């Protein structure tokens, strides 16, 4: 499970609207919240409940703030009509031989266009707006020692903080609430939906069966709940009369083996 930021600075931000703001994850699990209008990261869910080392959420906050300050710089660097949106992935992951693996990826108006070169220290892409703000990060002092000091040093230290104070969290499962409803669609044929309702964590695999033998997926939806857990239902069309043939399988983590579900 790794442990990444998500950042964004919009250079027309809407009134009463951040114009820069972070989310942290643990896995596909939200732990940090952070934006402009009140600058200050802030702990999520059961993170607010985690016992940490006192001056833990002042230093991501004095982090974020600082990444907050270059975004928005980035902006100054542009000579477009606008307007922009800069997205940043950094984050980290533990490796076997206790190394961790980085991640700094930025894209401009939701197009991947920037990455961190670690080897280096160096920003690198090939868009005219890329070497622009490659080149006014570049000029900043102890920017790029700070994203080296980000992503090698406190983001594999925050990792191992949460995975020891908060194990518990990360190992969370909980099964699905699975329902199989049949309706009608263009008459002489009948859809079925596999619904799976409230599970953690999110890799779920549903599989419909014909008279015990494969019929594959269907056509899968998944979307978070407000807790969050899961909600996943996969789609699959059927001859009318020839529902109950079919059945739908679940594999969760939450559960212990795969189960069958009926109508």
């Known amino acids: 499970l790794s442990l990444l930021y998500h950042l964004t600075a919009v250079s027309s931000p809407a009134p009463g609207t951040p114009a820069f703001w972070v989310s942290g994850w643990l896995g596909p699990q939200q732990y940090l919240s952070y934006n402009s209008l009140r600058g200050e990261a802030e702990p999520c869910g059961a993170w607010v409940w985690e016992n940490q080392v006192s001056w833990y959420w002042e230093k991501e906050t004095t982090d974020l703030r600082i990444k907050e300050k270059l975004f928005l710089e980035a902006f100054k660097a542009l000579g477009g009509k606008g307007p922009y949106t800069l997205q940043g992935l950094l984050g980290c992951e533990l490796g076997p031989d206790n190394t961790s693996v980085p991640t700094a990826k930025f894209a401009l108006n939701g197009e991947e266009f920037m990455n961190f070169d670690l080897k280096q220290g160096t920003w690198g ?43 518990g969290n990360l190992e969370w499962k909980e099964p699905p609430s699975m329902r199989l409803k049949a309706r009608p669609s263009s008459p002489g044929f009948s859809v079925l939906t596999c619904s799976a309702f409230s599970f953690y964590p999110p890799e779920l695999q549903l599989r419909f069966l014909r008279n015990g033998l494969a019929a594959g997926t269907g056509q899968g939806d998944f979307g978070p709940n407000s807790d969050g857990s899961f909600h996943a239902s996969s789609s699959l069309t059927v001859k009318s009369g020839d529902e109950h043939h079919y059945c739908c399988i679940v594999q969760h983590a939450g559960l212990a083996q795969p189960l069958r579900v009926e109508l």
Do not use: M
């Open 125 to 167: 892409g090939d868009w005219p707006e890329a070497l622009a703000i490659s080149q006014r990060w570049q000029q900043q002092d102890k920017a790029a020692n700070k994203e080296l000091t980000f992503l090698l040093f406190s983001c594999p230290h925050r990792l191992r903080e949460h995975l020891e104070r908060g194990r």
